[model samples]
Target: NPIHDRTSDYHKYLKVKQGDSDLFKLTVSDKRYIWYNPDPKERDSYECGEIVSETSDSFTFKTVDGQDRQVKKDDANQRNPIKFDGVEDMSELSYLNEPAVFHNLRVRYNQDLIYTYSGLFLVAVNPFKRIPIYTQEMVDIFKGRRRNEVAPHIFAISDVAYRSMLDDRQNQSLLITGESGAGKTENTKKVIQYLASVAGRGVLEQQILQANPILEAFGNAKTTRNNNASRFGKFIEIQFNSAGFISGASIQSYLLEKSRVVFQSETERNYHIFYQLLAGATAEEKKALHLAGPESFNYLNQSGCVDIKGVSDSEEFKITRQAMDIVGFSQEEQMSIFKIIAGILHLGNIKFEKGAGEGAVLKDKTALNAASTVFGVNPSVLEKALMEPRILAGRDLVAQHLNVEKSSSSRDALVKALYGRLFLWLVKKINNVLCQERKAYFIGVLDISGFEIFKVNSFEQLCINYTNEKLQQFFNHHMFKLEQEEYLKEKINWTGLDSQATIDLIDGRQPPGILALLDEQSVFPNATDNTLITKLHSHFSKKNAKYEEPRFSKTEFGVTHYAGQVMYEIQDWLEKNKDPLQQDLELCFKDSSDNVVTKLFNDPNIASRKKFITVAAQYKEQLASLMATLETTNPHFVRCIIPNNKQLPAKLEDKVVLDQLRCNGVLEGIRITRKGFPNRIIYADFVKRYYLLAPNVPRDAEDSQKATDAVLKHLNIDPEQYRFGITKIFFRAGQLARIEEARE
Candidate 1:
């Protein structure tokens, strides 16, 4: 009565009869018996096995004696469910059957088996575990001779699923996801590293390894969280045939976070390339690149908390130069890149001194001098390149004619456009190198930032989610009927291989996909940052036949559209509608610059053509030299997960801060759930509700004296329920901790 009157009948049942002797069996009514062995070390005993019978009732199972055994539910004894006895009981036990929190209750089984319950059907863990598999030589044998054969680790898991378009085809894809500090970017490098090691099994080894430094210098960055975070998502396809030889490959990228290169936190510096551009070059180098000095750059000033240990600007330049050599970049092409980087850095450093009465003055001559020294042009020529307009108003317009001045907003706009174009050029250069004609099979590893949702989300987050949605659509279309219809209808080739190229196509700009949508917002007249969000919300609302309801909130100036739960402020929509002349001018200028730059200096084209055979041959020699120098250097990748208040000890003083981060971080990741929507919603809601319902309950809290008292009181709930009409007291007095200090 002491146990029955205190605890619930359910808990009492588990405590009394459920033990190691009784196996936790799954019985299909009057059918077959499938059970788990509770003993840890019984050889040949069934630890856990699934029932293969199709019928719900009256089925058969193979017994230990190799005979068909059939049993009815009425003839068998049904024992109570099991209970979790903490570490002590777990150490002594071998099996678990029921939900640990609720005694005598069966554990809920999910039919889908997809982790996180996201409907996207893209399992995040499969690609993650593939990392160790590809690196391990033992696993390689299972994949067959074709380097593209599915690795054993990925293939071994019976429940793991993959969609393929073609039979007996070699397909590889890399799923890259994680926050800044989560090593998504660094792990990407390792993937490329592993591929380079394995893919070049018979080919030239030095060519494979040298590819990294070149790619890193142009593609990667040092951010607040990661020293080498990839600002973009890239996929490369490697083509092979009956033989396991690498024939060709191609590369594509998605949704680059370019804004971060120019601006960052007070505690963080801008992209590493910015500082490296400034400190790495000489006076002549700056002039050759047509860049002003660091003094001219707005974000390139020498004041910041961000530190690069044991790495000087000059040394970085040298290393980058060596990398260029390794990647088979020519002297002209390398100089071109350095010059462009230097120019942007100088543009960023250009200082605006506020005058007492007049608007502002360009007080710094250092930027101008640096630009002149690097570009092999006069200071005036460099100024004209930036400020003067050609063939405008039916005549060549000088800086004054174009209304270019220190106070002119157009001047700043032009500078930003130039810097952005420079960044795009660098990306194009890298893509050109990695991609080869007719190369189809490749393993693309994306290292972009995860979904970010905060109290105040922005256009960047919207664009990122939009891009991800397109990728998810690509995955769904390829793996399902949607893709088949489109491909067949459009007469597109459907080799039925699981390649990431189709996904990239949706996110690419040529045919106007997600990037086109984003660009439309950027180029549209009177468009603001939140234009994409407003358009999307409206589109979705209309599609759902709920057009009467406001998709975007109207304000005095514009509308604020909701991205997930966060409201984004929209700017003047009409302002984005620039005159045709201005639009033409912008487009013409960009295209012309690209054309001229390509003609003068294109590393990827130059490298791929194998024009500089001498330079290409020297790549290995240079890499060997660099490898010897780095022999003692060891690189480490650290993945850190910031803990929530519940994960921390109950006695912690900073509970509020911890809770805020957990809530914010999880919400941010949730906002990007277009494909995985309701799945993220379920988990997010559960985590938030759990934290709210049981604040600051530690994992080890059950062992405390307060918990003992609570457990004793809980035993009486059933008796008190009928007597006092009280069903439950979730927690007894003093069982939960009250925070003494609140930190904002």
Candidate 2:
């Protein structure tokens, strides 16, 4: 709609193109150069060179170091035309190759233009500094606009989604995917911000907005990779009314890293709520909750790193409190939530010592009294539950005393269970306040942890990585499989690629995949990590191609995922899968005076039942439901990129971006999108737009499909380049460029 705002080279680089141009082509009057990978082994490394001469079979190029080189035309990666230096959509490029994609991203990122379109999805690079692209004015610019009508932005994608929901009455999902520091959560906030501004009416919008701070205070924490890394997966659905106004919303969180409550790495801290309460509590509030500095608590002090640079925990606490108030949490409810937080802290401080005989005993009652006071449970009962509990033996009840190791592990398990249940309760209460009974449709935004590979991958890593494998297969299915399937359904000629074997290896139920194997091992009392590993080898060592038993270690196994091979350590998979919280502990908290505490302990989901489903099994059910929900919705993809290891702005690391691009299948998305016919238009819309170009077509054509066929014939478009679908015409990637050029 608007002309390209290019005043000079510097301004041109900073100012993104308002819209894409179809007339872009390489000119012979100008010199051309490209960034090419010099070594096949080092795929991420690249070197720039100029094309000095060319032949039918080969081309000679001058390197940046002033040396001439010759290579086959097929081996030489071509650069995009100069006019496409900062093309809005990668699919628009003449040569869609890796180096070209990387170069284009680097150029745009250097100018602080962080968002770009890559065929079917959006690629967002984290600009460590804030960009003013998310302001209200920007939101206004994107309302009801098409993707091609404006600069690439998160708001643009969100606005398109809102309009699609209104136009089709089908649910929409924005799957925001990336690594820890790749701004998945930040972009999620922007999406919600845009949705509220365009479709919002009043209080519900603000309530929806305020839900973030409360969730972040509990679900986010400082890690070695990212300062505000999300320790869980979140899917927030913003509901709409019949007239397309904001009605209400609901939040679904997955797998909160409850282990971090009782243990943290050297530089990592526990959840932010712990430090927030410690730093922000008033004198009276502190004394009542028995609060002290973070160093005083074993949970916070073990990390040896307490504070994040330039962050004030007290200030963040204020924001959290304000958000809680805005989200309809009463003062009593808020205080109860804090009491649970403080109680977890105090519970961490409880110490067990070896006593007379083999039993364990608490030498001091200080931490116990503090915890029990906040939790509203009997101090003696809590102590007894931690040290000694009753068991069933041959139709008789026996009171068993635990040793020091067992007692400490029991304490940690109690802490984890308390935190996990409280987290679920918070989500429930928030949903109760924000969700409506009836709604027309919704836009679900999923912000989950991306593929992770730490120094030592554990059960948590397995779950998260397994999730990503499914999501990646989902991408392959949607982007490649479904399209090819549709082509077959429509009787068109085509080909394809799929990743179901890897998925089956991880999630298959027929022969029992990794998770199923873990569940099987989790049930037996004599099973150890070695036994589990042996069981896995017995079933899949030579039988399955994706499974690998590491020769160097018996406790570690590798699964070749869609992303890459990740070796998972089987340290405590059995115990973690069981996730057993003592029945005695639940009984202790069930009669608490606090309402929230009592509700958490009494919730039916946590009640002692006849069935024993492992955590992996439960997670499988939840994931299946989530996938089912997504299958019914129109899905959108947003792949975020981390600029560097240090999380600083203006520095673009080639290998880091390349690895993300490869892992996330950005290049594969472009490949499949370009490989098949990527451009589609409904028959009526095609006839309406290009009727004038075909003199044989009537202005009021009753048969839109025949009119479209006639128009393509008039343009002399090759039959091999396009196909007719049931309701839409599919064109090869560059066919539309030709049609649009002729139209202009």
Candidate 3:
């Protein structure tokens, strides 16, 4: 069949060719260059061209436009050899440049291939349409196969990770990050499914697979950029036994966009669960909760978008409920979860009006009563908590009546707090059901937001961008550290590069980074967004290289992140960081008759805290722990790319692709991998493998270190090509290949 053959016409057209239309106009010199859009203002477009002549300072070339152009000799982007065309691994290319990397990606993208290897990581472009490569047949093709034996694919990398974990008995983590709507979630799902299919126990695997629908319904939402963007970062561990069978899994979520609970942009919508509940609830169920359509709630109706194309919220609701049932959630428990959903909707409808005095008055109690009824809390207590709250002064307990603004803020804060806690409870419940006490090793998959820049980046964006910065630094350190740590352990002299100063400026405590400064300012009762911005400017502006205070905007300050510079607006940084909730609201929720609501409010870890921790402090600690966990494991990086802004298939915008490649540091990653000594081996292993190439070194040498040294010298390796350690040898990129070639 044509399917098994690689020589078909369909395949032939998809193959990447070297110079264009060479048969039409043959040239003897065969020198070709990629004439790029060097203007920098235009798209990074390039075309194949030939060098016509060389002057003293510039080389003259004719573009495909049939026009003569001249470029400085050093500025020209010379083309790579034809043998490097369409190379699966970009590190293998002789010319490792931006345009070459971009061309390779574009070539593969045009052939309907989304995944390619760039050095040690896999680069995936969102196809925006279904490709039938992730099937049982495809998984079977990758099973037990080496990376070079199979085509570049997500399954291939995932397989390698699985095999590596089992072989080394060490934990493995897949760090998948990218822009919004760039298929991080899709790729994450594929990795999970592949592992489930390959190392699964029937019932447990089914439970693991079913958990996704419920999480997605609650944790994901539609934004301007993505239809199902995950508002939370999750690292899921699929635990396995010594025998290589998956035993259980646990999901740890980070910094959910709780602000989305109360507000959405013009084109955005609330979480999927809200719409799903409204569309799928039964008549009597809706009547009991006093619920109406989405249009009735301020939370859902504010956004113009109520539905996504080709997505059925009602059907998704059914799937989520079924998933809950399969994952061991009782029927009563499921309804309690639904009750909280309804309560939040009803809470959103309660209105506040400024009274004649400073205190605010409620427009109506109908919505408040509905929410109280569902939450099983007293309606009077709920209203009192929202409009007037008890606050402690120096030695007296005071009843404070808030104005319209503060009243509304308190109400929204309650709503956001409830949702955030409820999400945590749900994850805890899922973990309780899915986690197994008996497990040997685990594989973690991290799905998080990539570097995001918007017209007005907010606290949420900064949080995500900051997390991505730490992640990128982790990648940089791990890539260099893993290679050099071996050399240090073996006592070899080597050098390294660092991106820690930027991280230090963001999170450091000594000089008081942005987060520390924000934390300090948050404690001051007089602190406002302006005060916080001024504090940041006083500390970082002009003094710190990573921070920029724009002359045009007082409210905006920019941070030079590893990905790119993002300008963050200080609108509600203090309020967002404080994550304030009325004490009376917490007290009211603590007494709720609903089991789930009671647990969410009364969780010991939250209820027992003597002092409140700032959101940044909690996040910093959580991230530090996460980094510590990752340090003990081997990591595989997958950078996802958006093909187009329009989310259409078969359309690759050059500028869009180029920007992502830049932001993701795809070329930078390759450069580091190439510039450093990426390859290394223990002395024994090196001597054992290459002893045949150097016959003078004894096969049974007692001192393997000396044997390794003798072998390298006998092979005529340049002094700069390799470094010998006490117990190992480090080889620069491609240095080991030469020795391997001669041995073969």
Candidate 4:
């Protein structure tokens, strides 16, 4: 059987040569993947229906599954599909530069070598096990060595940044982002360790490193993806003085998942602090804090996975206490922290039953009393606060009896608010101890969420994915768009792609964008979910290529993300957009007898509104500030990849890895790296270093472009490999590496 090969330009599965084979080779260029009969019923009977002809290179393999493989004999099989052989970066692959090769390299090295580079980005696959790669010897091996001279390691990247920062006198930031379980958290820890080991103000460094346990306890949760999933965004900053020593460190935080306070998903545990306190509370402490066990609290018991495998909540509890002690949490402050947690748990337990007419009252007086005791408020006061909401109408205040759902919502709302405030207070407390001095420079490590697409997309998913979009824009601007803009199209074959237009379509800037329309619909008092959807379609569908009306639901819409299409549900979007806690409810916590609780939630003038920032507005400002710091610094991107959903060790699942590669932008980053001149330098800066090659050529301040091209010519660089623009030189991905080697 003859087949035509038309998959890719270069033959991916077979090679053609002159007079190499004794057997007659047909010229059919058929390329294929396994294709099972479309019907599942046909799968059983059609398994191995035929043994097709083989040309030594071509073969046929079949099975019941859709993934049955067939390729040339030289290619990797399903059993051993990785073609990696000490190639540190996937961009080095010869034929078919695609996600398959990228995934294969990661899987092959994932079992042995976890750190692999892909152009300007690092593809870190989670090994799920600790290896000796971080030993002192390994650290030294990579410390002063160049990026290409060593096996790919996180240290190599860290050292590169530190060296460049010192040599150039510029700021630096390592932007580390990936999915929940894709090892972002662990790698963030490793970056801090490397930085600390490399440079230190011993006192402050010890203090900053020790504070992680407390942060992790309050800010992390157990999720479907990771046991210690970070539910918030953190950027750890290590400030350096003029003398090049660590002055102090600060961890900036954003967007804690407060909703998880009252609700935990199936098999997902609540924030670790809640369980740690419950599991490890002392007998005397338990009585004071109203703690029993994790199962006793509604918030903790919901997921039913209180017992983490190989982890001791009690041990974590002890560790956090010691950390807090080191970080300067006094006995009274620590007690108040656990009390708020217990108070939220008690708030979850408060039951509501219908009263006469359209109102609800506390079903159990005893539970109300317990909640009041936890929050240090009178039972009657707390009861009125919950059952009857205080409404501000003009100058007059009115109290209305809330129905069951409304009052229960108020209860959970208060809990989420209190929990959110507590986490912020914890961060502030840590910062107070460390952020004392203004330093000469700082290196920021941003550990944020990756592109998220869940079964039910909500406000949280939108925010997370929107943040990713912004980051992608930044990457494109700095990596591809910026460099390509400098080069003239004199003989170039490709036009530069700009991702900023996509950004404009997103921020929904005035009268048009998704967010702008949402803000429009939000102005209405009783806006339905479809109202936003209708308005979005009314606004964006026809004009914007990014917006689409998804077929699944009337209230669902989709955004054609750089990664893929993300279908977002408009259900409850308007309400989730608003603050769950009303001004009056927030004021309830202000009057709590506990001093720490009062300070955390009290805005003496609760109606000012300036003290409270809306969730959306705060996220925008939060993202803007972080990216501002990143944009100013010499930044590095560490894109973490999850090898498998099962969290298995040394087990390869091809599709999952491939999907992550596509989703994480590795495939695109690599393709873009090869497609464009990603390396660039301004003319003046270009001649400042490489002028020695053509030293005899006098400096031309007015036009350094000529001097740059002369230096490149003197250095024997191929003209095709580089392009000179009006004021800069654009070089391909590895072009700069060759230049650096030439200089050395």
Candidate 5:
């Protein structure tokens, strides 16, 4: 027991005290972080553990490393820091189980290192600080090497992606997923950096990566726990030439959490661009844009997160400008972007009041006048549009009067819509300049927001979790579903339940599913949150196991999602799902001096489109296209984990990490990979990978089956373990891994 425990961080190192005046060193027990809290935990040291000895005045007890100390009752309740024994590669562990893998990662994180491999999966724990891992020397070490042949690195994933692309001649998509601040941003940067360095850097390639700071400036925000959390998701497309050299690059973004523009919960700040403008704008620029200060805007005032710890908004503003300039935005186009952001801030401050005349009018026209000049729109028409948005619904002009409540809500809605469209436009502009057609090959890196769960969940949380669920379903398919199909095709008996039933319960459009029910409820004029919840229970509770009516609250409903069960608040569900666009405000940019503003608002179908495809429907459409794009490409998954919220190293929480391992298919993936015989290769492909096992096999056989049979026959494999298709050879939980591990 001490042998295994001795290898743990607890026994490896610990601080001990003798009596009250003497200090010494000894081994403490191995489970140091175990005592830390997991309301989300990175273990905290407490004066607790195995009780070695007890006395009336001073109890002598043990700490990490089995080191004992005699101190007062109060000292035992106190805590201390601990460290872990780290590893460079994890595939070599003797027993491939969850606890074994978790132990290895905890030790690795305790050191200033993050990045481990579980077979093909690259597991990354956020280090929360800068490490020397991404140096150029590291890049060269990973180039053109087998993944297992090198130390674990993000660049290794890149190297393998490049190698697979050239050998197989296909596009690749590396999916980076995790919770907030699990280092998605850092991992993404490393991916881009590796590819750019190895592919013989081109101007377009450089420009595409350079635009990230600009994108982050507009997208990332500070949260309760994280300082540099990216509020949006993006997929970077790296194009290649015929000779396997870098050609061009492009970017496509998704789910920009635009609600943060109007209201951020718990005093969370909006996009960094707001604070950047507030921090960096000159007196002349501020006056021209009517930007008084950050507090002047309702969108920004609530958070009071004016200063992030490390970010220099003024310097960051300069970098954003430089990136924009390189990305081919003209000076005037750049000015228009800043002005629109400024206008949105000013637009938020303008309060509405019930007036005697027409509809709700702006009580403070000063802010209205400021927004009007910023966007080259009339103050009166903007106010009218804010209070009374007109659109065609079912062959009738649906216009409503706004009370102070509705007026404020409408203003926020238009502002969100405005900023959402602007972000899309910016991405489109980047695509035009950076994205070029590539027939040879390309590698796409998708860094989406991770699956989220909070005390209070809403539409944004709903969308994020749903996105992860679908992606995980696809992943199971990508990894195992195809393998199962081979078994079915060959009539080899096997049992595995796929996720199709689960997927259909939510996205199903037949007769009506959850999303469909929501869509149906959204169309009705008098639908309330209660009615929506009622429809969900009446229609789905019996048949669909995924949908559930949560207890205690009539206003809320729950769904047993793939990641976990989340009770979504339906109070604002319909309104946020509606996400109405301001049709009248489209004319505000007509004959406007700013060309960028005109381009964004010049669309003729703004109002007509909203009526048919609600916001939820539109996101599904975008997600479908993304899924389509990813389906064709070879996908590589990097499961990034956030080990304990303390951001400290040498910590472990069993269920916290277990949930990720189980839900994200890490455990399933490992179990399947170890025993899944996850590979079924064509005879030629099989020979290409493992011909060393039997070099005596014939160079040529009459048929592919004969060629496949010859290799196994030469190696003396069990016939019961393998099956053959018309042109391929399959092994079912065979000893193939044993042989491969032996050789490697």
Candidate 6:
């Protein structure tokens, strides 16, 4: 019911009215404009207000408050504003003897029309007083003739943000927020697509294209809502020379939900790799590693559906392997990554034995035996690494009192850490192979989760909210000057924008920043988590924050916290603890052996890190190998708008639907410079010719005269221009057919 209502409301609000003498009517107190049917005989209205103010190929509009709001003509959605009156009135006209007001503007309603002569009409009645925000010059620069010409979805948004980054000469980030099924992942893909197309230079195109598959292999998964959801946030940087060509690029990934990879809820499956490794690997491959099937793994063993979307685990594994190879991963490196994943599986299978006096201990040596057999290492040596002292410590500290208890916990912690870290390493390896030389002037695309509002809150929510806060801060910094000035002046910019600052806040070091403030418990050690939350609520209430503190309660599982409606119980697992003794770890390792070891122990190991590194490396190499590849690779982009069909009235036909689309600017405004025009064009001759196109209809037909009359009735065309071909020959062939049918 809600869906139908929402769609119907949108259609009602967006449709243009034709019966009125003016051909367009203001409704709901001028909030919207309606365009009437073009043919007087078949007069009807359809909502076409989506594209109200556009210049050239650009879409632009003035805000209700009178401030000029403009963007590239193709960026209509980004600069969309609520419509007012349909008329445009000049102040100077008000002072004249008999004010010449532009009213009774003809509105066109042709459902089969893909391109309208007058562009798209606004459903909202636009008051003539305000000047159009976008100019004809701005439109000429961006609009393309075909879907591939202009940026579509998040890709366009990312491109705009990237342009801003170049303009400001500062780092830029695109924050995509939406529910799972709302196309966040699709949008993110579009962003990457656009960036790769526009920014890659010389030989970078192949590398950039290859980079996506590598990232998807490591960072994406099928969820209830989305078939592919990105579980990590990434920031990519492209270096440019003075001439704006890409020189090199690099990437960094933020937090990853590693625990989810090994274990998921009843409704969800383990990460795709888990099943792929078990079901897809050849028996010989498994036997060589002494590995068991997916059913043996603690995480993947759960029952709901063993297979996903008709895909076998073994098939996915093969695909992953191919993806790895395509990204340029060597055989040894691929084996190394898989080995680590297998190690994690073994660790999950390890059964802890509880002695009478001692705490939990290994029940049997089965897991350890499995690990040794797979790694081609001695069982005793592997045992020592897992149970006893293996990681080298400072000589002075070893000689002094050692914290065996802490070290034991640390060992287990390291296993979990490595499980996540190794996965990320594989991603980096892939990226490195894919992003070889085209590292310069990159467009970084981020596909991360949106805000999670559930019944119970946990550490996850804290991290997500903190991320959003940082992004919001980013938006504020770029969108407004006052906020930026304050941040710069107070040295708060570093505190707010720097990723390290967020990391520090979450890890319990400084709880003064937004992240710290959210994790109030870390700041006040003595206070209960509840007390800290209350304090945060009060503090945020004072600030009038965008988010509200989640309500906490007790549930059957544990203490459930509410973030919106999703419920979460805080797991006992320890948050990431920064090791103070490893100062040397900060330096980048040069030796290959050391690098592997360092990666095992350190590195945040997020999905982005792996994907970014691997992709970046691949691009770099590709750029070096292929000269002039970037210029030749034709990049395609598509902007999509899923129509709200339910919004249509019961009486409306397909023609009305098409006409509504034109007026709303849904399918119109295809820039010839970018995406070539669609097959059909809808508009009167005067308007079409003005836009540089010939009418599709023959002039001698009575239907043509009727169509011309309809066009003149609804659109704002000069009578003098209507007589000439310039304003006439713009109708598409399909539009001519529709006019003929309507005439009959």
Measured by TM-score, the strongest candidate is 2
Q: Model 2, which residues run further than 4 Å from truth?
A: 1-30, 54-56, 481-497, 606-611, 676-744
My TM-score estimates for the predictions, one after another, are: 0.51, 0.88, 0.86, 0.79, 0.77, 0.52
- How many collisions per candidate? 39, 0, 0, 6, 12, 118
lDDT of 6 by residue, 241-333 (tens): 545555555555555565565556665666667667777777777876667766777756764545666566666677778766765677876
**Model 5, residue 729: displacement in angstroms?**
18
Off by over 4 Å in 4: 1-84, 103-107, 393-396, 481-497, 603-613, 676-744
TM-score computed on alpha carbons, candidate 1: 0.51
lDDT score of residue 143 within candidate 6: 27
C-alpha positional error of residue 491 in candidate 2 after TM-score superposition, expressed in Å: 12
Ranking by TM-score: 2, 3, 4, 5, 6, 1
Q: What is the model-wide C-alpha lDDT for candidate 6? A: 0.41
Global lDDT scores for all candidate models: 0.38, 0.83, 0.82, 0.72, 0.70, 0.41
Show model 5 residue runs off by greater than 4 Å.
1-91, 356-359, 388-401, 481-497, 604-611, 649-655, 673-744
lDDT of 5 by residue, 537-597 (tens): 8887665777777667777767777666777777766776676656676665554567777
Q: What is the lDDT of candidate 1?
A: 0.38
Clashes in model 4: which pairs?
A: 3-30, 4-29, 4-30, 5-29, 5-30, 508-513
Stretches > 4 Å off in candidate 6? 1-174, 194-204, 237-249, 359-363, 375-378, 381-412, 430-440, 476-598, 602-744
Query: How far does residue 619 in candidate 3 sit from its true spot (Å)?
Result: 0.6
Q: 1-744 in candidate 2: lDDT tens per residue?
A: 222344433234335644444322322235656566677688878887888998998888998778888878777666655555677777666556688788889888977888899867899999999777676756776788899877788888998899999999999999998888999999999999998889887877888999999989998999988999999899999999978899999999998999999999999989999999999988989999999999999999999988999899999999999999999889999899999999999998888988888588988899999999999999999988888987666698777898988888989999988888888888888999999899889999999877877778888887888788778877777776557777787777777134677777777898888889998888686689888888888888888998898988878888887778888888888988898777788889998999888988887764432267888888887888888999899889999989999989999999999898888879878766766776667788777766777787875698988999898888899999889988878888556645654542
Q: lDDT winner among the candidates?
A: 2
18-97, model 1: which lDDT tens digit per residue? 34442112211322234433343532123222234534554444555555555343322112212222211111111221
